[PDB]
């Protein structure tokens, strides 16, 4: 019986060595979750940045980022959202040009549905410490719709009527109206984000576009900021 | 339209169930002596999982168990000697369940990939990749070495044949996505609990849900037959565990404590059926006295939330695997 | 869709049910009869326990 | 009598507090599996150094100062001096290592997880303890630190009294290695960490526009500096010129430096996880 025990111990040692070798790789790799409204052009971001699940691995600055995206689970209830607890960040994709597109029908707005989804993600008992990277696609489409008449933000969003452009705003090298609309949408997302939790996790709103291809650098910088803030708060400096 | 007829049938069912009820289980089991306090200490702690653990399954011999984690390693343990017999890399990192075949030759696991993977231990390599579920599958169990039942997020349970790789039959008509599943000791029947707070009983051969139990208020995360096979206990996010009886067609007792409000993740029964062990979200799995619904003991070894809780077939030990990647053997 | 639901409920209607007292007595009798052969219920002797 | 007894009470309280805090933090780290981490391994090394200090050199030093003589053997007073140097050097260098670990964690986030491992933590702790042990025992035990003037020779030949007399070279080297290099390293890494913290705070203020780091780094630097800097300045000064520095001031500043061992667990073990672990322990 001693020979069997010795062989089993040798097998255990081999499995433990393999487990350590895999642990090095697992700790090296950072995981991201891609969650979007569905019609917000998440695929266009995937093409530029890079079964129900779709996993792509992109590395930048010798850092391995592994992105997970799920589209098969279209149910409103999200019981798989609780598994992405160790992910570095949740990439949120929202089409800011979908305010006018009302909805199946009877939905208030696609942007309103995205706001509700973002609120549900933020106010989750499990994703309390998971930060969200927010991408607003179709900035060109939003500009085309806003500059064109007969489609006003205030018609669908009454809060836009009593709104002014932020003083501490950085316009791109834009019209006043499109800038006001973009910053109103960003402020809506930020007011949804900041109120629930403080310090545990932050929202990073980026005004990306289909033509833009620097989203990988933005995601890298956002992940670096997220880990720095996590480490700073763990040591009680931030 | 037909909704009025459905409501009338539901009212008739409720009236029949109320008329069948004469006395509660408490009124009968209050006379018998209580179980008393029970203290359980972690005999062995199993170490080596990189990430959080979702599901485990004790072997038939009670010597071995298989554990699933998000790092992709499907580790098979020797619970007596605390040794890793095998470690199986997985195609998808995200896994929600695992199973151990009664013969011990096969091990099945699945996750968010919507695919049930079956691995042959003695030949490790993937024997068959089962596809046909549109939603994520949450639990897998083995009837025999050839038939496997998977519970998916498609709100439909399916029975597969490993040799042909196609579903022999499917179980439909259940509103929410199912997360828990338990087979009968005779393997003729099984149950599933979904997010619609209703746990249904199916017949594997017939393929129809004979009875439906809707006592819970929130999504059902756990389910498990009584060892007799005539009863089963369900755990939900409503912080309540309820014991349902098939012949009585309703719940007998509810296991709730006012101090704790965290939901139940996994439940299991002792060999005699007297003790109902239910994990909780508060990092503590509790031990209930099934007959009197009085909590006997609490296990506090784990740090993170428990996700799986099983009892050996011989009844010697209870294994709980939590999100801190540590699986503890209790006795 | 509703036809399937009403048919299923009609099928569930005609099921014989035993009084809750009888079922509770059966579960209690099972628990009493199998109480002895339970390692969890009765603390296992140290020599008998495989783990320790 | 009362004045002598009054000192006895304060040294008894000091040694009791140091031992209690160090054993409590070591027990908290060892008991629970969640608390073991590379940084917590460094905390364990610091706690072990401070516990050895409190068990060995604080009570013997108190007995020496109260009884005004060394009843024990000459080899034993040399051993006491070696253990004192070892404890001080190990504690300060472990503090420096903790500061370096925090600086690497904040400055290089992606590489920090792969840079520091359990094995690397073990080898760093072993190297720190090895260099501390060298600096302590190798000069003292090999008798390279004894002074040349007859005042030290009379004290070292006699058995009743055994005080500290040191060379210029050994005192300078010991002070440098024990305090000044760790001081420079800690100051630099904490300045960089403060800059990164204020940068992150500025970024947080930039978006969603419509202190704590300063206080934390202030207490961390202030405790260590106020405890050790005067004593090492005196170490340099009494060697440079012997007249001004009296023995009483030297011993007083040495004990003020000793109290840093007791103060350390309050600073480095003040986390909610540690507080929960302490509540579980007692
Ligand atoms: C007897 N007291 C000793 C003597 C000299 C000395 C101390 C501490 C750290 C050092 O680097 C030293 O050189 C003191 O604790």
From Swiss-Prot, chain A:
Superkingdom: Eukaryota
Bilayer topology annotation: Lipid-anchor
Assembly with partners or alone: Heterotrimeric G proteins are composed of 3 units; alpha, beta and gamma. The alpha chain contains the guanine nucleotide binding site. Component of the TAS2R14-GNAS2 complex, consisting of TAS2R14, GNAS2, GNB1 and GNG2; within the complex interacts with TAS2R14; this complex plays a role in the perception of bitterness. Interacts with CRY1; the interaction may block GPCR-mediated regulation of cAMP concentrations. Interacts with ADCY5 and stimulates its adenylyl cyclase activity. Interacts with ADCY6 and stimulates its adenylyl cyclase activity. Interacts with ADCY2.
Gene that encodes it: GNAS
GO BP annotations, alphabetical order: activation of adenylate cyclase activity; adenylate cyclase-activating adrenergic receptor signaling pathway; adenylate cyclase-activating dopamine receptor signaling pathway; adenylate cyclase-activating G protein-coupled receptor signaling pathway; bone development; cellular response to catecholamine stimulus; cellular response to glucagon stimulus; cellular response to prostaglandin E stimulus
Region named G3 motif: 65-74
UniProt region (G1 motif), positions on chain: 31-44
Region (G4 motif): 133-140
One Pfam family in the UniProt entry: G-alpha
CDD domains attached to this UniProt entry: G-alpha (cd00066)
Gene3D superfamilies: GI Alpha 1, domain 2-like, P-loop containing nucleotide triphosphate hydrolases
Chain residues that bind Mg(2+): 43
Comp. bias (Basic and acidic residues): 1-12
InterPro entries: Gprotein_alpha_S (IPR000367), Gprotein_alpha_su (IPR001019), GproteinA_insert (IPR011025), P-loop_NTPase (IPR027417)
Enzyme Commission number(s) of this protein: 3.6.5.-
Entry keyword annotation includes Magnesium: yes
Swiss-Prot record, chain B:
Keywords of the record: Acetylation, Disease variant, Host-virus interaction, Intellectual disability, Phosphoprotein, Repeat, Transducer, WD repeat
Effect of residue 101 to T: In MRD42; decreases receptor-driven G protein activation; decreases complex formation with gamma subunit; decreases trimer formation with alpha and gamma subunit; no effect on protein abundance
Effect the entry attributes to changing residue 89 to S: In MRD42; decreases receptor-driven G protein activation; decreases trimer formation with alpha and gamma subunit; no effect on protein abundance;no effect on complex formation with gamma subunit
Result of altering residue 75 to T: In MRD42; also found in patient with hematologic malignancies; reduces interaction with GNAI2, GNAI3, GNA13 and GNA11; induces activation of PI3K-AKT-mTOR and MAPK pathways
Acetylation found in the keyword field: yes
Entry GO terms, CC: cytoplasm; cytosol; extracellular exosome; extracellular vesicle; heterotrimeric G-protein complex; lysosomal membrane; membrane; photoreceptor disc membrane
WD repeat segments: 41-89, 90-131, 132-172, 173-214, 215-258, 259-300, 301-331
Molecular functions (GO terms): GTPase activity; GTPase binding; protein-containing complex binding; signaling receptor complex adaptor activity
UniProt PTM: Phosphorylation at His-257 by NDKB contributes to G protein activation by increasing the high energetic phosphate transfer onto GDP.
Pfam families xref list: WD40_Gbeta (PF25391)
Example GO biological process: phospholipase C-activating G protein-coupled receptor signaling pathway
Domain of life: Eukaryota
Residue positions where Phosphohistidine is found in the record: 257
UniProtKB/Swiss-Prot annotation, chain C:
Gene Ontology terms describing biological process: adenylate cyclase-activating dopamine receptor signaling pathway; cellular response to catecholamine stimulus; cellular response to prostaglandin E stimulus; fibroblast proliferation; G protein-coupled receptor signaling pathway
Membrane topology value: Lipid-anchor
Any one GO molecular-function label of the UniProt entry: G-protein beta-subunit binding
Keywords annotated in UniProt: Acetylation, Cell membrane, Host-virus interaction, Lipoprotein, Membrane, Methylation, Prenylation, Transducer
Domain of life: Eukaryota
Keyword Membrane: yes
Annotated localization: Cell membrane
GO cellular component: extracellular exosome; heterotrimeric G-protein complex; membrane; plasma membrane; synapse
Broad class of where this protein is predominantly found: membrane
Tissue expression remark: Expressed in fetal tissues, including testis, adrenal gland, brain, white blood cells and brain.
Keyword Thylakoid: no
Protein family (similarity comment): Belongs to the G protein gamma family.
Oligomeric and partner information: G proteins are composed of 3 units, alpha, beta and gamma. In this context, interacts with GNB2. The heterodimer formed by GNB1 and GNG2 interacts with ARHGEF5. The heterodimer formed by GNB1 and GNG2 interacts with GRK2. Forms complexes with TAS2R14 and G-proteins; these complexes play a role in the perception of bitterness. Component of the TAS2R14-GNAI1 complex, consisting of TAS2R14, GNAI1, GNB1 and GNG2. Component of the TAS2R14-GNAT3 complex, consisting of TAS2R14, GNAT3, GNB1 and GNG2. Component of the TAS2R14-GNAS2 complex, consisting of TAS2R14, GNAS2, GNB1 and GNG2.
Record gene name: GNG2
UniProtKB/Swiss-Prot annotation, chain D:
Gene Ontology cellular component list: apical plasma membrane; ciliary basal body; cilium; clathrin-coated endocytic vesicle membrane; early endosome; endosome; endosome membrane; Golgi apparatus
GO molecular function ontology, one term from the record: identical protein binding
Domain of life: Eukaryota
The UniProt record lists the keyword Coiled coil: no
Spans within the Extracellular topological domain: 67-77, 146-167, 241-247
Topology in membrane: Multi-pass membrane protein
Residue intervals on the Cytoplasmic side: 30-42, 101-121
GO terms classed as biological process: adenylate cyclase-activating adrenergic receptor signaling pathway; adenylate cyclase-modulating G protein-coupled receptor signaling pathway; adrenergic receptor signaling pathway; AMPA selective glutamate receptor signaling pathway; bone resorption; brown fat cell differentiation; cell surface receptor signaling pathway; cellular response to amyloid-beta
Residues given in the record as (S)-carazolol binding sites: 84, 174, 254
Keywords on record: Cell membrane, Disulfide bond, Endosome, G-protein coupled receptor, Glycoprotein, Golgi apparatus, Hydroxylation, Lipoprotein, Membrane, Palmitate, Phosphoprotein, Receptor, Transducer, Transmembrane, Transmembrane helix, Ubl conjugation
UniProt keyword annotation of Cell membrane present: yes
Membrane-traversing stretches: 6-29, 43-66, 78-100, 122-145, 168-191, 217-240, 248-271
Localization of this protein: Cell membrane; Early endosome; Golgi apparatus
Residue numbers of Phosphotyrosine PTMs: 112
Cysteine pairings via disulfide bonds: 77-162, 155-161
Binding site for (S)-timolol: 84, 89, 235, 254, 258
Family: Belongs to the G-protein coupled receptor 1 family. Adrenergic receptor subfamily. ADRB2 sub-subfamily.
Protein name (database record): Beta-2 adrenergic receptor
